[PDB]
């Protein structure tokens, strides 16, 4: 696998440094690297494609070398090197395009394409310029059974699943007590609503809780806990759970009282924060448990007193809400992000040539279903395909 990254990095560096007029004493290293690459590459053919509409292509390799005779590069030397470089770039692009689409249920961390499988042979192991890039370095470190990591921005890890769970319910929905939450992207907003407004509640306090799991362990998460949620603070009319009737929602946002935020790992308490708003830091967590209390106003005013009639007739329900955002995090496994187009590259390459759905990736690369039931084989296959995608995105801008 590392051979492909070495080839891509060498090609990019050569395209960067070989420009007209530069002194040869600054590209001696790259000249030696390129000559070694040409010496080892020649004489071995390749085949790519064969599945779907992907163009089947055959490959040959017969090229000269880059001698050392000049003192400053002229136009003609640069042109010859550039002509070879563009062909090698096309080769890398086509090999990657072949590799990205396919997959396998077993051995999903090993190469699959014929060209890549032949490249993994020992006689090609003399070309490895560096491993400075993030994804290739992580792959190399993961090769030797070591802890890894990924610097991610807005690391979407929460699956999209809009759901609510009622706690107290009239048959015709006139006295409701429950919770509404919506986990979109890397944003969690949880709201706790009551119709009684704590007029008949025990000790005039209503208890709210909500637990959201996480399939993959993160680290170093800067958490912005902002109260006064926005997802449920406006009139609504939605169908009931059984899908045979509807209900109304007339909200009033109160002050969330005694906000408790807990981060757990392996079933133990790791980091806790009481009644703090703003930005907080969590170091290691796998399950998030948000709980708080809704407190009835101890004293009211005419408008407020009318707005919460003690008796059953209700026309204004009360609700409190919180917002959970992950503005930064580091994970141990590959995940979708927003600082690149890796998942975008995978989706585009999958859809462009209409490869029939295999046995691992759900159809259309819909991220919701892919992240729903996370399994280690799926994670390994996604890691390999994302490494190949990052290789592609480091050649074509």
């Amino acid at each position: 696998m590392d051979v492909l990254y070495s080839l891509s990095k060498t090609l990019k560096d050569a395209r960067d440094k070989i420009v007209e007029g530069t002194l040869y004493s600054n590209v001696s290293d790259l000249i030696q690297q390129f000559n070694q690459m040409i010496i080892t590459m020649n004489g071995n053919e390749f085949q790519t494609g064969g599945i779907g509409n992907l163009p089947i292509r055959n490959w040959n390799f017969n090229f000269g070398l880059l001698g050392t005779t000049l003192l400053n590069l002229d136009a003609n030397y640069v042109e010859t090197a550039r002509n070879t470089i563009d062909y090698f770039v096309d080769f890398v692009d086509n090999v990657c395009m072949d590799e990205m689409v396919r997959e396998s249920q077993r051995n999903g961390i090993a190469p699959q394409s014929d060209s890549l499988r032949k490249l993994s042979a020992i006689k090609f192991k003399r070309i490895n310029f560096d491993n400075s890039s993030e994804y290739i370095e992580n792959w190399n470190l993961q090769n030797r059974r070591q802890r890894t990591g990924f610097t991610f921005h807005k690391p979407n890890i929460f699956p999209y699943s809009a759901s609510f769970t009622l706690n107290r319910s009239q048959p015709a929905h006139d006295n409701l007590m429950g919770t509404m939450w919506l986990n979109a992207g890397s944003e969690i907003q949880v709201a706790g609503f009551d119709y009684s407004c704590a007029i008949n509640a025990p000790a005039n306090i209503q208890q709210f809780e909500h637990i959201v799991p996480l399939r993959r362990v993160l680290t170093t998460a800067t958490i912005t806990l902002l109260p006064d949620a926005e997802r449920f603070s406006f009139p609504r009319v939605i169908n009931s759970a059984d899908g045979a009737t509807t209900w109304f929602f007339n909200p009033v946002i109160l002050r969330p009282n005694n906000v408790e935020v807990e981060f757990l790992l392996n079933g133990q308490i790791i980091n806790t924060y009481q009644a703090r708003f703003g930005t907080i830091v969590a170091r290691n967590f796998d399950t998030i448990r948000l709980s708080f209390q809704l407190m009835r106003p101890p004293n009211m005013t005419p408008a407020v007193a009318v707005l919460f009639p003690n008796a059953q007739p209700f026309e204004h329900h009360a609700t409190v809400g919180l917002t959970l955002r992950i503005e930064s995090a580091v994970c141990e496994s590959v995940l979708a992000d927003a600082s690149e187009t890796l998942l975008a590259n995978v989706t585009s390459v999958r859809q462009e040539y209409a490869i029939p759905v295999g046995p691992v990736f759900p159809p259309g690369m819909n991220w919701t279903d892919l992240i729903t039931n996370y399994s280690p084989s799926r994670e390994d296959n996604l890691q390999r395909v994302f490494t190949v995608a990052s290789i592609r995105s480091m050649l074509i801008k």
Partner: protein, 182 residues
């Protein structure tokens, strides 16, 4: 039973059994087998203060208030016991945790040894439970003596923390106090 043998104290399933054990152990506060402060002391103190401040109570009304307050006050009680540098704590609401006194590492829970030891051993009211203790050990640089006394709930170090006005201890005390109502 749940202990080693038959005794008058061993008579989410783990959560329910531990909650029943804690509810029965609540009566240990009348057995004079405690160390340091206890919940009933706080209940009596708040009752005295609110009796003195209040003025809308007739002499015919005191017995009812005392009877209701001595029972309903503080339903969320916690207890912890110590065995060979290990600590087991159980909550009435259904909380149960175990940790070591050196670095507060999470310890898997064993109901059998808890039931074996709580029968005849010192019991200390868990004013500072594991949540507050761990938050304090993380966010504040306390020394070993302070932590060891906190597990024993020494009044001097607790009052020193009160003087320092640490927000976590204030939150714990205020949450405990707000629960004191009929």
């Amino acid at each position: 039973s749940i202990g080693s043998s038959a005794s008058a104290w061993t008579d989410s399933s783990v959560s329910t059994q531990t909650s029943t054990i804690s509810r029965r152990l609540r009566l240990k506060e009348m057995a004079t087998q405690t160390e340091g402060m206890n919940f009933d002391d706080i209940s009596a103190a708040v009752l005295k203060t609110k009796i003195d401040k209040s003025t809308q109570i007739s002499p015919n009304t005191i017995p009812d208030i005392v009877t209701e307050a001595s029972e309903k006050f503080i339903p969320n009680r916690a207890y912890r016991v110590i065995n060979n540098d290990d600590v087991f704590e159980a909550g009435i609401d259904g909380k149960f945790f175990a940790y070591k006194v050196d670095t507060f590492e999470e310890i898997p829970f064993d109901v059998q040894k808890f039931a074996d030891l709580v029968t005849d051993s010192p019991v200390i009211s868990a004013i500072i439970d594991f949540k507050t203790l761990k938050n304090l050990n993380d966010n504040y640089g306390i020394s070993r003596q302070q932590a060891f006394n906190l597990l024993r709930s020494d009044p001097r170090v607790l009052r020193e923390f009160i003087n320092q006005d640490n927000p976590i201890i204030r939150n714990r005390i205020e949450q405990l106090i707000m629960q004191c109502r009929l």
